[PDB]
Each structure stands twice: as C-alpha cells, then as structure tokens.
Write an enzyme that holds these catalytic residues in place. Sequence first.
Site, mmCIF file in Angstrom:
data_model
loop_
_atom_site.group_PDB
_atom_site.id
_atom_site.type_symbol
_atom_site.label_atom_id
_atom_site.label_comp_id
_atom_site.label_asym_id
_atom_site.label_seq_id
_atom_site.Cartn_x
_atom_site.Cartn_y
_atom_site.Cartn_z
ATOM 1 C CG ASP A 65 -1.853 1.229 1.281
ATOM 2 O OD1 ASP A 65 -1.985 1.910 0.234
ATOM 3 O OD2 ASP A 65 -2.484 1.502 2.336
ATOM 4 C CB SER A 142 -0.500 11.169 -17.495
ATOM 5 O OG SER A 142 -1.618 11.784 -18.100
ATOM 6 C CE1 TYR A 155 -4.347 10.594 -13.644
ATOM 7 C CE2 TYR A 155 -4.494 12.100 -15.541
ATOM 8 C CZ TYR A 155 -4.062 10.888 -14.973
ATOM 9 O OH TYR A 155 -3.316 9.962 -15.712
ATOM 10 C CE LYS A 159 -0.776 10.277 -12.917
ATOM 11 N NZ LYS A 159 0.162 9.108 -13.193
#
EC number: 1.1.1.51
Lengths: 285, 285
Positions: A65, A142, A155, A159
Amino acid sequence: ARTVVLITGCSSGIGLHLAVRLASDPSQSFKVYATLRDLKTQGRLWEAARALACPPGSLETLQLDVRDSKSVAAARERVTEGRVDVLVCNAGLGLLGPLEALGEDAVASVLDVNVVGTVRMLQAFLPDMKRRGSGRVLVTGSVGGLMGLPFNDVYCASKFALEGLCESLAVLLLPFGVHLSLIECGPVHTAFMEKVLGSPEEVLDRTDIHTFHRFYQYLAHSKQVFREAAQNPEEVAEVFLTALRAPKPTLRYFTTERFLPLLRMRLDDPSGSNYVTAMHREVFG
Amino acid sequence: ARTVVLITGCSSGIGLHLAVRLASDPSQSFKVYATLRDLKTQGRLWEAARALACPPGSLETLQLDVRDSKSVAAARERVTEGRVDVLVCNAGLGLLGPLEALGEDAVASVLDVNVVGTVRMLQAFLPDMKRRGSGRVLVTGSVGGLMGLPFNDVYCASKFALEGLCESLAVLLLPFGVHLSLIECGPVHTAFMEKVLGSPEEVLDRTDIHTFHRFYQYLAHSKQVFREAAQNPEEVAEVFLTALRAPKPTLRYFTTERFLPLLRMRLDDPSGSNYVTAMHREVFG
Ligand SMILES: NC(=O)c1ccc[n+]([C@@H]2O[C@H](COP(=O)([O-])OP(=O)(O)OC[C@H]3O[C@@H](n4cnc5c(N)ncnc54)[C@H](OP(=O)(O)O)[C@@H]3O)[C@@H](O)[C@H]2O)c1
Ligand SMILES: NC(=O)c1ccc[n+]([C@@H]2O[C@H](COP(=O)([O-])OP(=O)(O)OC[C@H]3O[C@@H](n4cnc5c(N)ncnc54)[C@H](OP(=O)(O)O)[C@@H]3O)[C@@H](O)[C@H]2O)c1
Ligand SMILES: C[C@]12CC[C@@H]3c4ccc(O)cc4CC[C@H]3[C@@H]1CC[C@@H]2O
Ligand SMILES: C[C@]12CC[C@@H]3c4ccc(O)cc4CC[C@H]3[C@@H]1CC[C@@H]2O
C-alpha cells in the site's frame, strides 16, 4: 544475476502488462516483484502470467500500500535478492469531475497515492541505488502531467507534481549513476469511466447546471479521443523497455507523438493564453 | 461598491505586502480580508498597515487554516459583503533538503497546504463567482513550479501541481467570465533558510555523505542567486495588481524575465536532457 525489477500497481493496466512482459521475456533475465494494494485483485495478473508462460520464479506478488510506509518498508524487506535494479513507480488513481463536486477525501487520496506514495517508494529505494552507484527508476507519467485537461484538475495536479518531483531529483542523481525516467502515456486501453467520477445525479447535486453540461461535453470528447487514439498496453509497455535498455536514458519518454503539437503551442506561449484557448475549443468546440 | 479581496497567508511575504498595497491604495477601492493561519502572527501585518496608513475599514484580519475546510467555510462566512471579487491563493510552505531526509509528515503537510489547501479555497469560492459570472483568482506560483530545482523535490512537486490545477480549471472557466491567473515569482526578499530545512546534523544523520556535500553546494548557489536576483515584495505585489486590472488576464504572469531562457531550453527539449544537464552544471558546476 537477473535484473530485479519491482513494479507498483500491478492489478491492471500498464503495471500488470509490464510485469508479465518482463517476467516472460525470452531471455529470462528479469526477476519481477509485482506489487498490488489488495492481493484479492491478483488473479488478472496470474492469468496473464500463465498466458505468456512466465517460468516458475520469474514473477512474485507482494501486497504493498503506497499510502503506507510500513507497507513500503515490508515489501522492500521481501526483496530476497537484497537489491532492486529497476523500480517502476506506476501506482496511480484518476479523478474526474467538476472541482466543486470532488470530495476532500477523494482529492487527498489521489495526491497521497500519486504523489506522496511515489515519494515514499523513492525514499525507501533510492538510498541503496545511490550507494551502489546504480539503478533505474521509471515513473509512469501522463499527457495530463504535461498540459491541463478540464475536469481533471486534481488528476493533472498530481501528474504535473510527479514531473516536478522527478525533474528536481534527476538534476541531483545525474552524477550518482542512478537514472530516473518518466514514461509519458496518452490514453491506454483497459479502463472505466476514464479514471473515476460520480453518478450524474451525484455530480448534478454537487455542481451548477452549466458546469454539468460542460462536463458531458468533455466526456463525449474524451470518449472519442480514446476511441481514435488509445494504445494497447503492450505497445506502451515496450516503451518502458526501451527506456530501461537505453545506456543513457533521458528524463522523458513519450509513448506517442500524437499530443506533441498541442504540447508545442503550450511550450511556445509561456503566458498560457494560446493553450487555454486551443484546448477550450478542442474540448468544448 | 469596493472590490472585495480575500488573500490567504498574510503573516509575511507577498501576502502581507499585497494586503497592505491594496487596502492603502490611494483610490480606496479595495476592501481586503487578510487571512492568516495563526492570529498571533498578525502584528507585522498591522504594523505595515499603519506605515502605509490604511484607512479604517479597508483591511480586516481573519483566522483561516487552509488545511481545514471548516476553517475555510468559517472565513467565507465572515465576508460581510456576501461576495469576494478577488481571491488570492497565496498561502504556501517551502521544503528543502535531500528527499530521504524529509519527514513523511513534512511532505504531506506541504502538499496539503500548497495543493489541497488551494483546492479547498477554490471549491468554497468559485461556485459563487461562476454564478455571478464574475470574479478574479490569482494564485502565487513560483519559478520552481515551471522547472525542477535539486533538493526542492517536494516543493517543486507542489508548485508544478498548482500549475496543473490552475491550467485545467482555466480551460473550463474561460466561458464563465471567471479569470484565474498564476503569478510566477523568482526569489523574493524576506525569508529564512530559503524555505525550510533541518540542521546539518539532522540532514547528515538522514543522508549519505556525498548527497550531504551536494546539498551544501546547492545552498551556496541558491544564496548567491538570492543575493543577485531577489525582488522586493513591493515590486512583486505590483504584478498582482497588473494582473487584476487586466481587462483580459492571461493564465500566467512572470514577475521577472531572468529565468525565461532556462525555462526556454526546458521547453525546447521535451526529453528533458538539456535542462537536466544545464541545471546540473548551473548548481553543481
Ligand atoms: N489508463 C490509461 O489510460 C493511462 C494513460 C496514461 C498514463 N497511465 C498511467 O499509468 C499508471 C497506471 O495506469 P494503468 O491502469 O494503465 O495501470 P495500473 O498498473 O493498473 O496502475 C493503476 C494501479 O494503481 C494501483 N493502486 C491503486 N491504489 C494503490 C495503492 N494505494 N498502493 C499501491 N498501488 C495502488 C492499482 O493496483 P494495485 O492493487 O496493484 O495496487 C492499479 O493497478 C498511472 O500512474 C497513469 O498515469 C494510464
Ligand atoms: N518567498 C519567496 O522567495 C517566494 C518566491 C517565489 C514565490 N513565492 C510564493 O509566494 C507564496 C508565499 O510566499 P511569501 O513568503 O513571499 O508570502 P506569504 O504571504 O508569507 O506566504 C507564505 C504564507 O503561507 C501562510 N500559511 C502557512 N501555513 C498556512 C495554513 N495552514 N493556512 C493558511 N496559510 C498558511 C503563512 O501565514 P499565515 O498565517 O497567514 O497563514 C505565510 O504568510 C508561495 O505560494 C510562494 O510560491 C515566494
Ligand atoms: C489524461 C489522459 C491523456 C490525455 C487525454 C486527452 C488529451 C487531449 C484531449 O483533447 C483530451 C484528452 C482526454 C483523455 C486524456 C487521457 C485520460 C487518461 C490519460 O492519462
Ligand atoms: C524556487 C525559487 C525560484 C527559483 C530559484 C532558483 C532558480 C534558479 C537557480 O539556478 C537556483 C534557484 C535557487 C532559489 C530558487 C527560489 C527559492 C524560492 C523561489 O520560489
């Protein structure tokens, strides 16, 4: 003897495909530790491993984790070889929706897994690579880490963060013989929703009608971009291999040139006016 | 009638100077709510307010902890006018040192205040501006939000994050009449350590001797960059005013052109090889 590789987030996508790509490599030169947050999701991994006939002992699964350093320390401990030659920070969470509709918890989670979780992996594994004066680190980036996308505010925040994280580190590591590399992927096949959002009733209750309309427009557009541009994780996974075989790896690899021109107008107009307008019409017409 | 402005992080630096710059503006057109995490640090603010003779009622102090949405909701509530015309997301934490020497807590804190804290302010204040179809948001960025700096890995992660956060949002807000703008500052006078690090014994205990050496080299270099390039917060504060007066604000304002060329080689080599090398020799010779 073998190149020990430890990959995070292997229940699906890039991570799962990359693990099996390596473990089953005809040369039998990689020893792979595929980590996953919950071991109950490990079946897709073992089923892919059987399909590509990974030989016994080329692949092992570990529960890790990334939101927990004790968990990070425990999996580190599990590396029988006593060293990791290639670390792939792949674990990631997506988050899509109007900013105002995102739960605080959801927002904190995303940065905790995408950003702080990568920081944890690096704190635990870089020390040893720096000492030996060797090791490779590949981080899955990304296109959203290179340019802002509407409704992916958090998000993108995470990134873009990884870019800053890895870039700062790279300037330091250069002389320690440790190579860090970001693999910039555009859309990749095998997903759902796009990343993760809420039911339209949930999102409508949490935003104005007009933003709600815009969201739909963004979703229709993204679905078409996936349909016409999405890559097989097999093709994306090979880029990770190109990077790890490079005798002198660069800080950044792109799995596609499809977004480079848009990345260009972004780079050529520091003020951001051209990109914001171009991306606006690109999504919302 | 007046332009209601709410600024976060006003105990020092840019935030404090910007609050007093506005409240004391000869035109008496700004009503300013200067927020601070701890009210015990409000004296520098009131002392500056007296020096620039801010007229009674042009400036008010509010306790606002950006790491807490109840605190964010409470200060929102305190805005007597019932609207905020200009929101300045300025609150920020620095963090400097070898990655391996940073406490997990310190890392999570930085992203919680710099990133999630800005997300909180925006969730609480954008809704109303979108409704009215008006409002300006200024976010204080950094050159470290545009290019990675060694030993500032997490700080850069958070500043790069804000770029992604604001850029994604800007592409959406364009048609709502709400303007968001990042103010990119290079070094600014009035600081300590640079941002925040640990005693050399603390850092030595937590890192290898060679990384420890490199750190010192980075520190000597940064101290010289501050000495020769640091701007008065008065000059930086005026850039926030140029942005807020722009009838059509761009996504990004730069307080100096000094780092643009370095930002250029970064922009012109997508692979990052040129920037990493250039920045390496720039800091470590
Ligand atoms: N999917 C796309 O369209 C696409 C496009 C561009 C880039 N990428 C990038 O590739 C990465 C993964 O995307 P993917 O779906 O293609 O591959 P992936 O290998 O499935 O990565 C997502 C993974 O994160 C893991 N994860 C979630 N929470 C975690 C936690 N707390 N600790 C550790 N791991 C956790 C999940 O499985 P575990 O159980 O293993 O942990 C899951 O496998 C991201 O960083 C993303 O930027 C994907
Ligand atoms: N200093 C430089 O050299 C420099 C250079 C470039 C850019 N900047 C940027 O300007 C910003 C501030 O730097 P500055 O020192 O010049 O000005 P600043 O107005 O002092 O901002 C730092 C502030 O953050 C606030 N803060 C800390 N924790 C907080 C929390 N939990 N909640 C709310 N506020 C909190 C502090 O005072 P409160 O008590 O008010 O909250 C403090 O005033 C940053 O975002 C940074 O990128 C500074
Ligand atoms: C952000 C991603 C890359 C960039 C993609 C993009 C890129 C350009 C664009 O106009 C729209 C989209 C929508 C889907 C995006 C993708 C969703 C997953 C992937 O990581
Ligand atoms: C990151 C900052 C801007 C960029 C500065 C820089 C920029 C270039 C460089 O070679 C070194 C440094 C050190 C100090 C940095 C600054 C410390 C505070 C500021 O926000």
